[PDB]
Scaffold this active site. Structure first.
Site, PDB file in Angstrom:
ATOM      1  N   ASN A  30       0.702  -1.105  -0.016  1.00  0.00           N
ATOM      2  CA  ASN A  30      -0.264  -0.107  -0.059  1.00  0.00           C
ATOM      3  C   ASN A  30       1.016   1.135  -0.120  1.00  0.00           C
ATOM      4  O   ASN A  30       0.411   2.303  -0.589  1.00  0.00           O
ATOM      5  CB  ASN A  30      -1.013   0.091   1.091  1.00  0.00           C
ATOM      6  CG  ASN A  30      -2.084  -1.166   1.003  1.00  0.00           C
ATOM      7  OD1 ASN A  30      -2.294  -1.667  -0.079  1.00  0.00           O
ATOM      8  ND2 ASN A  30      -2.767  -1.413   2.156  1.00  0.00           N
TER       9      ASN A  30
ATOM     10  N   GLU B  50      -6.785  16.278 -18.565  1.00  0.00           N
ATOM     11  CA  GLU B  50      -6.181  16.275 -19.940  1.00  0.00           C
ATOM     12  C   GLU B  50      -5.327  15.216 -20.500  1.00  0.00           C
ATOM     13  O   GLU B  50      -5.285  14.946 -21.759  1.00  0.00           O
ATOM     14  CB  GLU B  50      -5.155  17.654 -20.077  1.00  0.00           C
ATOM     15  CG  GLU B  50      -4.730  18.237 -21.215  1.00  0.00           C
ATOM     16  CD  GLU B  50      -4.387  19.870 -21.298  1.00  0.00           C
ATOM     17  OE1 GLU B  50      -4.965  20.593 -20.614  1.00  0.00           O
ATOM     18  OE2 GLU B  50      -3.139  20.003 -21.472  1.00  0.00           O
TER      19      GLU B  50
HETATM   20  N1  LIG Z   1      -3.072  -4.042  -2.202  1.00  0.00           N
HETATM   21  C1  LIG Z   1      -3.641  -4.628  -1.307  1.00  0.00           C
HETATM   22  N2  LIG Z   1      -4.729  -5.435  -1.711  1.00  0.00           N
HETATM   23  C2  LIG Z   1      -5.616  -5.788  -0.718  1.00  0.00           C
HETATM   24  C3  LIG Z   1      -5.499  -5.285   0.767  1.00  0.00           C
HETATM   25  N3  LIG Z   1      -6.211  -5.875   1.705  1.00  0.00           N
HETATM   26  C4  LIG Z   1      -7.169  -6.703   0.838  1.00  0.00           C
HETATM   27  N4  LIG Z   1      -6.385  -6.705  -0.501  1.00  0.00           N
HETATM   28  C5  LIG Z   1      -6.846  -7.697  -1.571  1.00  0.00           C
HETATM   29  O1  LIG Z   1      -8.300  -7.508  -1.652  1.00  0.00           O
HETATM   30  C6  LIG Z   1      -8.918  -8.730  -2.125  1.00  0.00           C
HETATM   31  C7  LIG Z   1     -10.042  -9.166  -1.114  1.00  0.00           C
HETATM   32  O2  LIG Z   1     -10.784  -8.126  -0.844  1.00  0.00           O
HETATM   33  P1  LIG Z   1     -10.873  -7.466   0.618  1.00  0.00           P
HETATM   34  O3  LIG Z   1     -10.645  -5.872   0.372  1.00  0.00           O
HETATM   35  O4  LIG Z   1      -9.942  -7.924   1.372  1.00  0.00           O
HETATM   36  O5  LIG Z   1     -12.441  -7.712   1.167  1.00  0.00           O
HETATM   37  P2  LIG Z   1     -13.739  -6.684   1.216  1.00  0.00           P
HETATM   38  O6  LIG Z   1     -13.389  -5.692  -0.095  1.00  0.00           O
HETATM   39  O7  LIG Z   1     -13.624  -6.070   2.705  1.00  0.00           O
HETATM   40  O8  LIG Z   1     -14.917  -7.673   1.103  1.00  0.00           O
HETATM   41  P3  LIG Z   1     -15.447  -8.437   2.066  1.00  0.00           P
HETATM   42  O9  LIG Z   1     -14.525  -8.942   3.237  1.00  0.00           O
HETATM   43  O10 LIG Z   1     -16.081 -10.005   1.455  1.00  0.00           O
HETATM   44  O11 LIG Z   1     -16.738  -7.963   2.719  1.00  0.00           O
HETATM   45  C8  LIG Z   1      -7.937  -9.771  -1.978  1.00  0.00           C
HETATM   46  O12 LIG Z   1      -7.208 -10.132  -3.412  1.00  0.00           O
HETATM   47  C9  LIG Z   1      -6.588  -9.120  -1.063  1.00  0.00           C
HETATM   48  O13 LIG Z   1      -5.231  -9.460  -1.784  1.00  0.00           O
HETATM   49  C10 LIG Z   1      -4.474  -4.230   0.929  1.00  0.00           C
HETATM   50  O14 LIG Z   1      -4.512  -3.709   2.012  1.00  0.00           O
HETATM   51  N5  LIG Z   1      -3.699  -3.929  -0.154  1.00  0.00           N
END
Ligand SMILES: Nc1nc2c(ncn2[C@@H]2O[C@H](COP(=O)(O)OP(=O)(O)OP(=O)(O)O)[C@@H](O)[C@H]2O)c(=O)[nH]1
Ligand SMILES: Nc1nc2c(ncn2[C@@H]2O[C@H](COP(=O)(O)OP(=O)(O)O)[C@@H](O)[C@H]2O)c(=O)[nH]1
Ligand code: BEF
Ligand SMILES: [Ca+2]
Ligand SMILES: [Mg+2]
Ligand SMILES: [Mg+2]
Lengths: 420, 440, 57
Positions: B228, B254
């Site tokens: 992140n 742009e």
């Molecule tokens: N780059 C990045 N990817 C993340 C992060 N947290 C989760 N992911 C990715 O997001 C995907 C899963 O979705 P999440 O955001 O964790 O879950 P959510 O959007 O809260 O959905 P639910 O938990 O099912 O309600 C996976 O592919 C993770 O690798 C993060 O902090 N940084």
């Protein structure tokens, strides 16, 4: 989603439930007085999943103890952490099924089901976000088998949109000589196949084969078997009880583990029974499985791996990729990335490192095949029915249970033979 | 004016929002309590940073942001973290039960219970804007909330705000940090229903960021914090045109004119340089030419794909720090005579250049070194369709057996939505082949 | 300019209606899914009442 309501029914259900509450209690630093005396705040992080917060900072298990025989009432309270359970969550009868599925499912069990349901609701009413239920019980007995499945279908009526989990102990002639166990087991899976979301198959034939051939125990106790059950029950719930990312709640685990609603019977594994490479391959070994199934006689639909202890996550990631690519033939290719791994910092008591395995493998059909074979060896003779017909049942229920369990087997075989 | 409202959905969206707003505060000199001693106009003003920060009478600079998750865990860390004073509590929305990696639960069962509250709080941010420009939506493709609730949200924003611009920062799933087997499903579903409602989407492949952290920054096992903090740098390069000014600063809109040849072809490839450790950056600062060369090394891309095997429809260079046009033009000339950059025959080959002189900054305790000059390249290349092909193939493998589909039907979805979404992707893959063929 | 207005308004309109249909169609499917599993659970109770009364005869 936070709170899990735990139910233990029958002799086995209450026994393995006690030692489950004993182990996680030590991991969460909770003495039998419900007081906290740990040193890592990671123990109290998700304590609400299994523990209520009472008056004075005391933690009471969200547990309900059931049995048609008032034998286990004494044993639980007399055993360690007997006081920790709240007195009102004890509901018991006086005359049990005597290893009769019908007595526990339709008559003496149905007379008592309204009583336990009242305790389920009060325990669920004060849940901030009820996550689901987990039941511990045997499938070869009377109460846990017959009344356990009835209780599942009754809770599911009032909570149809909640996860139903079961730790179902399967019968084996190697541990119990009771003859009516193939009957009780088949009638139970007939219900589990329909009304539960996740079932950990704790096979008694497996537990004994490990105690005898691996741990070198000539005449192992039920405690020796239960020390294995407690070890894995703590392993499969690690992701539920500690702050983590993967399979942190029952529903996420279900979505990850169950590709078809009926194929929800898991093959738990545990290691040891030490480096990360050895933990991995032992964890994937047939001998370390808690179900009498050779995973290399079938194929993996999904797998959840859980490593616990201080270790190099890089090494874990490499070894889990190593074991997958070297054994790719045993992972269905039409489910990509079907092996998920979690790491927890704190280990189980007594070990530096440990690995717990949860596998949805088509090889589980071997377990159901053995039961139906022992079932059909008595049904073809029309044997010992009057203990079941005498309670109101008919042949329809027996033949329908037989057909449904054989359908589960062929469905596990249908996806074992599927290709891309 | 031209305010920009950011919406962070789900764990990935929220945790990426944390990294971004922390970096913004460091870049603008904003303290954890919102105070900015350099801002001499109290309570308001139309400075460049006001596109992203509103101002209170007490001198607090408040992110024009909404944090929404269907579970309180991740946003609770915001409420108690270092920047808890930065956000008014009304900007952090939480449910109590997440979508459990299920698009249906995020879009319907659970998401419909909170969508009206989210739009109400977004409305209250829009009401403080004198000339709202658009929305920035941060979310994952694979999570149940990041996929299902985002598409529901994007649909509702199209209704409530017409064709007001909506940009996405989308986290594309990678097996190294994936949490759900059904992430291919949620990805196809959210891309299909959002495609009409998104003007421009920056996809971030978690495996690309994962490899960069391992390869370029000596991280044996990168965490979300590692990913992140790198993602925020890219997001910062993209939004720097909106938050700062300068004679050579080129507005993002742009670049967007050059990047979107057709409404559906709105997925630019991002590549960022330099990603370097402090140990290697010490006593060696990389020139303009060196970081520009790195933009065309595929290992520095935010999405795994090979532009050498595709065609370019646009190429934008967003420079940051100590950079003058003379060095840029020289570096571009070297590249055009040493790299494989083929354009479609229906668009010009000139590179569009923007320079913000405000140098990049690092988060304390971070991994990447503080550099005097950085560059983010935004390119529209047909090669990004490779990312769709990889996802569409995983979708097909599981859907041919209807694996896990019952979890979606159980929540109210129909098989038709799966096949309808898949064929939209098929047509999208086909649209990317068409724009690449030469004219006749 | 009147065509541009007509276009944006029609985009808003049809997006509002497709979402309205999806949220209604999804509710009807989920309710029917739950209505089916509950009616199948009550039939287990009819079979239970029919079993425990067949014992007397
Ligand atoms: N780059 C990045 N990817 C993340 C992060 N947290 C989760 N992911 C990715 O997001 C995907 C899963 O979705 P999440 O955001 O964790 O879950 P959510 O959007 O809260 O959905 P639910 O938990 O099912 O309600 C996976 O592919 C993770 O690798 C993060 O902090 N940084
Ligand atoms: N592993 C294990 N199995 C048990 C235990 N107690 C009973 N069983 C098994 O459960 C079956 C008998 O069921 P039982 O517990 O008596 O059912 P109940 O009538 O509901 O209490 C037999 O096959 C036993 O092997 C125990 O403590 N551990
Ligand atoms: F021992 Be059980 F109640 F059949
Ligand atoms: Ca000001
Ligand atoms: Mg008993
Ligand atoms: Mg989440």
């Amino acid at each position: 989603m936070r709170e899990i309501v735990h139910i233990q029914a029958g002799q086995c259900g209450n026994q393995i439930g006690a030692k489950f509450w004993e182990v996680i209690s030590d991991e969460h630093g909770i003495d039998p007085t419900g007081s906290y005396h740990g040193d890592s705040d990671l123990q109290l992080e998700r304590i609400n999943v299994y523990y209520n917060e009472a008056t004075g900072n005391k933690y009471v298990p969200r547990a309900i103890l059931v049995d048609l025989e008032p034998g286990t009432m004494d044993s639980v309270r007399s055993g360690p952490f007997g006081q920790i359970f709240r007195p009102d969550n004890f509901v018991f009868g006086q005359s049990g099924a005597g290893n009769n599925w019908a007595k526990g499912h339709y008559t003496e069990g149905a007379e008592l089901v309204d009583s336990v349901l009242d305790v389920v609701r009060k325990e669920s009413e004060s849940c901030d976000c009820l996550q689901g239920f987990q039941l511990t019980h045997s499938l070869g007995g009377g109460t846990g088998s017959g009344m356990g499945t009835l209780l599942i279908s009754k809770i599911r009526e009032e909570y149809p949109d909640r996860i139903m989990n079961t730790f179902s102990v399967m019968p084996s002639p190697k541990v119990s000589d009771t003859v009516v166990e193939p009957y009780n087991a088949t009638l139970s899976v007939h219900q589990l196949v329909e009304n539960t979301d996740e079932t950990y198959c704790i096979d008694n034939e497996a537990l004994y084969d490990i105690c005898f051939r691996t741990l070198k125990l000539t005449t192992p106790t039920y405690g020796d078997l239960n020390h294995l059950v407690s070890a894995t029950m703590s392993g499969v719930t690690t992701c539920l009880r500690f702050p983590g990312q993967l399979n942190a709640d029952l529903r996420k685990l279900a979505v990850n583990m169950v590709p078809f609603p009926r194929l929800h019977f898991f093959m738990p594994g545990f290691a040891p029974l030490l480096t990360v490479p050895e933990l991995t391959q032992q964890m994937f070994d047939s001998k370390n499985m808690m179900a009498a199934c050779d995973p290399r006689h079938g194929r993996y639909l999904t797998v959840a791996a859980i490593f616990r202890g201080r270790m190099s996550m890089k090494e874990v990631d490499e070894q889990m990729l190593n074991v997958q690519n070297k054994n790719s033939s045993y992972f269905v290719e039409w489910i990509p990335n079907n092996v998920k791994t979690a790491v927890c910092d704190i280990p189980p008591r007594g070990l530096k490192m440990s690995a717990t395995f949860i596998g949805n493998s088509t090889a589980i059909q071997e377990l159901f095949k053995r039961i139906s074979e022992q079932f059909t060896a008595m049904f073809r003779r029309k044997a010992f029915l009057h203990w079941y017909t005498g309670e109101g049942m008919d042949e329809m229920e027996f033949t329908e249970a037989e057909s449904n369990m054989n359908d589960l087997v062929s469905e596990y075989q249908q996806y074992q033979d599927a290709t891309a | 004016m031209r305010e920009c409202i950011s919406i962070h959905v789900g764990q990935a969206g929220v945790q990426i929002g944390n990294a971004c707003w922390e970096l913004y505060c460091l870049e603008h000199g904003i303290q954890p309590d919102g105070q900015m001693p350099s801002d001499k106009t109290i309570g308001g003003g139309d400075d460049s940073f006001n596109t992203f920060f509103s101002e209170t009478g007490a001198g607090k600079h408040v992110p024009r942001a909404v944090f929404v998750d269907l579970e309180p865990t991740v946003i609770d860390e915001v409420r108690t973290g270092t920047y808890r004073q930065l956000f008014h509590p009304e900007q952090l929305i939480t449910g109590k039960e997440d979508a459990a990696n299920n698009y249906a639960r995020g879009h319907y069962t659970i998401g419909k219970e909170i969508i009206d509250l989210v739009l109400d709080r977004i409305r209250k941010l829009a009401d403080q804007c004198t000339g709202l420009q658009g929305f920035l939506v941060f979310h994952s493709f694979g999570g149940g909330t990041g996929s299902g609730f985002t598409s529901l949200l994007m649909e509702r924003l199209s209704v409530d705000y017409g064709k007001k611009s909506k940009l996405e920062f989308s986290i594309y799933p990678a097996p190294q940090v994936s949490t759900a087997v059904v992430e291919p499903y949620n990805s196809i579903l959210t891309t299909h229903t959002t495609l009409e409602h998104s003007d421009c989407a920056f996809m971030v492949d978690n495996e690309a960021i994962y490899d960069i952290c391992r390869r370029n920054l000596d991280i044996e096992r990168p965490t979300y914090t590692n990913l992140n903090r790198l993602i925020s740098q890219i997001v910062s390069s993209i939004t720097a045109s909106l938050r700062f000014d300068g004679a050579l600063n080129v507005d993002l809109t742009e670049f967007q004119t050059n990047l979107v040849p057709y409404p559906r072809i709105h997925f630019p490839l991002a590549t960022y340089a330099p990603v370097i450790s402090a140990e290697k950056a010490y006593h060696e600062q990389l020139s303009v030419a060196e970081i520009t060369n790195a933009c065309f090394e595929p290992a520095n891309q935010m999405v795994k794909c090979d532009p050498r095997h595709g065609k370019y429809m646009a190429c934008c260079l967003l420079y940051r720090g100590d950079v003058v046009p003379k060095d840029v033009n020289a570096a571009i000339a070297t590249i055009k005579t040493k790299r494989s950059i083929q354009f479609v025959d229906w668009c010009p080959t000139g590179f569009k250049v923007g320079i913000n002189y405000q140098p990049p900054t690092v988060v304390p305790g971070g991994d990447l070194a503080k550099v005097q000059r950085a560059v983010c390249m935004l390119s529209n290349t047909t090669a990004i369709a490779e990312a769709w092909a990889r996802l569409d193939h995983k979708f097909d493998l599981m859907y041919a057996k209807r694996a896990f589909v019952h979890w979606y039907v159980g929540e109210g979805m129909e098989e038709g939505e799966f096949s309808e979404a898949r064929e939209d992707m098929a047509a999208l893959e086909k649209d990317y082949e068409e724009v690449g063929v030469d004219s006749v | 300019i009147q065509k541009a207005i007509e276009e944006n308004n029609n985009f808003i309109k049809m997006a509002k209606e497709k979402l309205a249909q999806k949220m209604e169609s999804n509710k009807e499917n989920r309710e029917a899914h739950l209505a089916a599993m509950l009616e199948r659970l009550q039939e287990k109770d009819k079979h239970a009442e029919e079993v425990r009364k067949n014992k007397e005869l």
